[PDB]
Amino acid sequence: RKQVSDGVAHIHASFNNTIVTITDRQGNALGWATAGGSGFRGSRKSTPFAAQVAAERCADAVKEYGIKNLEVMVKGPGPGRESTIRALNAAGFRITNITDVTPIPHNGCRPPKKRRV
Amino acid sequence: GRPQRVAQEMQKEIALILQREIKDPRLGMMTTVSGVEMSRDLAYAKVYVTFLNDKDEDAVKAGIKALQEASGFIRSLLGKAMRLRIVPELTFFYDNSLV
Amino acid sequence: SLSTEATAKIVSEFGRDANDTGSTEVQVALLTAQINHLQGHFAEHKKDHHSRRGLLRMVSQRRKLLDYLKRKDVARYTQLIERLGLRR
Amino acid sequence: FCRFTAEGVQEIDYKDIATLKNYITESGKIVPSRITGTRAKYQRQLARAIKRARYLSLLPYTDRH
Amino acid sequence: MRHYEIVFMVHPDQSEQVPGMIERYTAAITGAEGKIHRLEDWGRRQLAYPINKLHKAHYVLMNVEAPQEVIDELETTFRFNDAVIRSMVMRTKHAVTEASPMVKAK
RNA sequence: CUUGAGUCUCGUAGAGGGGGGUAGAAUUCCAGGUGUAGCGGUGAAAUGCGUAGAGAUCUGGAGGAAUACCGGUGGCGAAGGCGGCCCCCUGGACGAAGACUGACGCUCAGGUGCGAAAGCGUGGGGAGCAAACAGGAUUAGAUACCCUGGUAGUCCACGCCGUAAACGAUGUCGACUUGGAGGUUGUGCCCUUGAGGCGUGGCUUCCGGAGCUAACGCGUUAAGUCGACCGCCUGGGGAGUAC
Ligand SMILES: [Mg+2]
Ligand SMILES: [Mg+2]
Ligand SMILES: [Mg+2]
């Protein structure tokens, strides 16, 4: 249908879960990739390799609107997050910038207690 | 205790101190830890950390020593972060995550 | 706490002269004025115990002076106590 | 390393955005005197000054806003 | 009266009353022993961070030795009124009448 | 009598206190938008939860809660303690300089207060969190830890309560005695002068001499030397208990 040509995706670089989404240039996110959704579960959903492979699910939605540029965000410090970025560069889609936007509060929210052995 | 179980919890703690609490970062990058290898009783922890530094030992070496030089200080940090009597010995390894 | 101008007005009459600043009278008068200013603050701020702590530090102070004065010349004391309208 | 003393300002007017910007990161976090070597009072004056300018919108809390 | 340095902004769009309201505010100053030791306006300047989804707010400054009460109604006014979009009031050790970093650029 | 004590004037720093404002993240919720097949959980699942479209993204709102960086031996304090910005109120500290008062002092039984958290009371308030309790994951004591929930509580206001390893496990004050390196904050001088050179105050830190200590150590911020007052103990258990 409608071309965008300026790629903008959102990822959720959580530890136990790894999920990227495709977004329109003016917000309005359209389509997404879940590595957990691929059937990978537990350690397999969290694997950096699962995050790297989840590129194909993100790519097919990008291909449908044929978007090229790359302005994507990373929220959460997932293990081997740089390797997932390498996989996006390995894909060869033109890269404009990546944003390390792990949200930091002012301590306003009360944290929950940490788990123990 | 059970090492293969405590490993998941420790990796989250190691990442939080690594990203927001640095003032000598030769890496100067979001270096991400692929895995940890704690010994029985957690006496020694092997931290395998990949480097967002172009994956070249030249840039990577700058940080791995930087990872090792500030260990006692960071020891305190993780040492006062999980109520652990065992403060794990800190070791650092560039991972060939990409082959 | 105070205005230097109010302290000067007290020093002119309570003190023998402007330079006379240690005279027990010229001392207790200033403490009594300070207590009155603090009392206005406490009327709406009962919680501010920390400020009450000083409040004590002075009511007792003059209390010592009074005696020190009273054991020195009740004459001035007697007038002072009524000059300052205290211990009525 | 006595650079504010070289400027000569015992009290630092907060409206000085150009000095504030050097003491502010791209994120907007205040760099410490560990590396800037500024004396504490000015360090003290600057941190309070940055917040008030930030409230007035002179300084960004963070570009992401 | 005691020293103050005061800055606020009115919505850029409501700049029709911005020149008059100042002195209309100094009506308090001019009418209640207000010794305005300085006043500055800078005009619309892009906000570093957007406030209430607004940009280029109309910047203005004041320097007065003012009594305790006048400032109060003065700011409650701001608290009351709505053309103004954010306010601020800070005491100063002494009066400041020197070019301010905003104007000193000019 | 004036050095002890204390006042005046000049400042000066400070998360000191009380009040009232206010900001921005964050989190939850809610709104929409686009956009879905999940989602989150584990070691794995379970548990949760999604086509009502969730999960994600923007846009918006609501609410409550707390104030990243700065920021640390760094201060503030009797101590408990104090950490967004503004204003109102208010305690104390300190320097300098001069004057004034003139022993006006210290300690304190009894005394009166002060007072971490949880808890009790009333009424509030309700983010997030989390005892209790609740669903899935069990038998060396599983009675579980783990995940999934979750009330009180957690906040307010006023009340009670009066204990914490409230710990420097070091009472208060004063005096005297080798060092060095810091920090901090005053302030004098002398360099134009930063810097620099002389200082000289306050507070704080680390070594450390002598000395002292069973040892450990302590060490001009003494556990050295002394003084004054107070407080306390007299093998351990029973026991801070019966009453
Ligand atoms: Mg509570
Ligand atoms: Mg006790
Ligand atoms: Mg304590």
DSSP string, B35-95: EE-PPGGG-EEEEEEE-TTTT-HHHHHHHHHHHHHTHHHHHHHHHTTS--SS-PEEEEE--
Instruction: Write out the two tokens for E7.
Output: 């800055």
Contact A69, A35 (CB under 8 A): no
Burial (CB < 10 A; 0-12, 13-18, 19+), residue D8, is: exposed
Report how far residue E25's alpha carbon sits from residue E61's, in angstroms, rounded to the nearest whole number: 12
Q: Is the CB of A117 under 7 A from strand F?
A: yes
Q: Does residue E105 belong to the interface with chain D, where contact is any CB pair within 8 Å?
A: no
> Rounded to the nearest whole angstrom, what is the distance from the C-alpha of residue B12 to the centroid of ligand 1?
30
Return the domain boundaries, chain E.
1-92
Instruction: Write out the two tokens for C78.
Output: 């007697």
Contact B32, A80 (CB under 8 A): yes
Chain F footprint positions (protein CB, under 7 Å): 5-10, 12-19, 21-27, 32-45, 55-60, 64-72, 74, 77-80, 84-92, 98-105, 114-115, 127-130, 145-147, 158-159, 183-186, 194-196
- What SS3 class is residue B22? coil
Structure determined via: cryo-EM
CATH code of B3-94, in short, is 3.30.300.20
| Bridge partner residues of C72 (DSSP) | none
How many CB atoms sit inside 10 A of residue C85's CB?
A: 8
Number of domains in chain A: 1
Minimum-distance CB partner of D60 among E9, E49, E88: E49
What are the Cα distances from residue D44, in Å, to B21, D2, D20, D29, E20? 22, 15, 13, 15, 38
Burial (CB < 10 A; 0-12, 13-18, 19+), residue A75, is: middle
**CA torsion through residues D5, D11, D16, D21, sign:** positive
Q: Which domain holds residue A74?
A: 2-117
Q: Does residue D11 belong to the interface with chain E, where contact is any CB pair within 8 Å?
A: yes
Best CA proximity match to A19, nearest among A33, A9, A40:
A33
Burial (CB < 10 A; 0-12, 13-18, 19+), residue A74, is: buried
**CA torsion through residues B25, B28, B30, B35, sign:** negative
Minimum-distance CB partner of E49 among D11, D13, D61: D61
- What SS3 class is residue A113? coil
Nucleotide nearest to D36 (CA to C1'): F70
User: In the block, which residue shows the tokens 């402007």?
Assistant: C18
In chain D, positions 1-60 with C-beta closer than 7 Å to nucleic chain F are: 2, 5-6, 28-34, 39-41, 43-48, 51-52, 54-55
**CB within 8 Å: E48 and D55:** no
Quote the DSSP letter at residue A37.
Answer: G
How many CB atoms sit inside 10 A of residue B86's CB?
A: 16
Q: Is the CB of C20 under 7 A from strand F?
A: yes
> Rounded to the nearest whole angstrom, what is the distance from the C-alpha of residue C56 to the centroid of ligand 2?
27
